[PDB]
């Protein structure tokens, strides 16, 4: 009996180690499973961008450029979306508008190279895409003077000239669609809160949600999933832990009680 | 006596067994739900990744913005050409809808009042940019020179939007191939049955080559979105469960070994 107490005292005093070893996981489980919360919900919300930026960059052919930017032709400098710079803040609206999906427009030097450039689209499955033979393209220039000129308020390499004056060549800033009234139907203007009115009695509108910007986002997802999948890993192997304490104290608890009864037959 | 609580003893052992036999159903139950569920968040982010770009396609056409015009209520909006305009021949039909492209999303509308009005309600609600038709105010396109076959010859349309249809193909004529048009490239608007477009602006446009499947692709979401929570919830009630029971055997197995140690005490007295 007086050598049988050392006996149940080392036991609770590996219990007690335990119950501390447990609480000291369930701080970083409680710790760990709420940071992944938190790291798998900016994930989600930039996954989505992530998608939708590029499920557009296809409808609009943009990814299509970046990987036709990986071929040799001499005369090929891109597509208009790149080209050309508006000045400040402003117009970037109206000039968006008034290029829409003519800033997707590849510009080439001569037929030879677009009739190459689309080879590469069809001997790769790539899709449609618009070229602009620099050696063909048939310029358009302002006549009357109502509103600033689009092509006034932007800057682009003075050797793609004609392709510029080809898309935005007619084109006339205005303000309010009060302004544009007296000409509509005459001069191909758009205003400012994008309201394009085509000579062709076209009229174009509409506000959509605009919040390089997208390979921040690759880098930006691929260290949210890094962050994620080590986590869910610790997470994972802590909370086989956690149990291994649980299984061993349920197992020590049952021990000390047989030994209880014990105590009291001496 | 002895026997009395020997025989007591065997009795709890009897359910502790049962316990530790359900426990077992548990955990196969509730493997058996991990390896579903695994499966179905699979499908689920492999499928909804596809309304995300989907729905973002919606937006750059302008599709959606379109669909949302329908349930507007401002009478004059009429719909898409592509929804108006249809090819009575096939296989010259790539052709048409090259002839389109962005042309192809354009609203037809009676008047540009019926435009404002639509304008207005797209800002207003952010669906998105689009371009509109006015029957009442758009300028038909014809063709003076006959080089080639009409894009109009093979296009079928209610004769009341007329004005609409020859504003998109009205000076668009279909040739058979690249070198059957060269003797008047940039010209006459040019439009292969391979599929090329030579504008008389000079600009070329070609490459490689329904939108009706996000309607029942939101709903295959829907589903998985709805299935996950069932699976889901049916793992946390059942592991509930399974930790109620493990409650219990433990409760049993301090119970069991007093009674064990009665018996010891009743073995080394008889």
Redesign the interface.
């Known amino acids: 009996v007086e050598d049988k107490r050392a006996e149940i005292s080392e036991i609770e005093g590996k219990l007690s180690t335990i119950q501390a070893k447990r609480i000291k996981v369930e701080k970083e489980i409680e710790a760990k499973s709420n940071e992944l919360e938190k790291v798998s919900k900016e994930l989600e919300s930039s996954e ?1 961008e992530l ?2 930026a ?3 960059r ?3 052919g943009n990814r ?1 450029a970046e990987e036709l930017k990986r071929s040799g032709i001499g005369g090929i400098y891109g597509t208009l979306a790149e080209l050309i710079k508006v000045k400040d803040e402003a117009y970037a609206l109206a000039i968006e ?1 008034a290029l ?2 003519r800033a997707d ?1 590849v510009v080439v030097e001569d ?1 030879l190279v ?2 190459k450039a ?1 080879k590469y ?2 001997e ?10 620099l050696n ?3 310029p358009k220039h302002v006549d009357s003077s109502v509103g600033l000129p689009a092509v006034d308020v932007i800057e682009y390499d003075q050797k793609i000239e004609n392709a510029v004056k ?1 898309a935005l060549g007619d084109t006339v800033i205005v303000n309010s ?1 009060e302004e544009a009234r007296p000409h509509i ?1 005459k001069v191909r203007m758009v205003t400012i ?4 009115y085509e000579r ?10 605009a919040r390089v910007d997208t390979t921040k986002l690759r880098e930006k997802v691929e260290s949210l999933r890094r962050r994620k999948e080590a986590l869910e890993g610790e997470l994972n192997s802590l909370k086989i832990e956690l149990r291994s304490l649980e299984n061993a104290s ?1 197992e020590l ?2 021990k000390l ?2 030994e209880k ?2 105590l009291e ?1 001496a």
């Open positions: 989505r998608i939708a590029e499920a557009q296809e409808v609009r299509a508008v829409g999906n427009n037929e677009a009739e689309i689209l069809k790769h499955k790539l899709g449609r895409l618009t070229f602009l033979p063909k393209i048939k080809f669609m139907g809160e994008g309201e394009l062709s009695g076209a009229i174009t509108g509409g506000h959509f949600r349920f608890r049952i009680s047989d009864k014990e037959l």
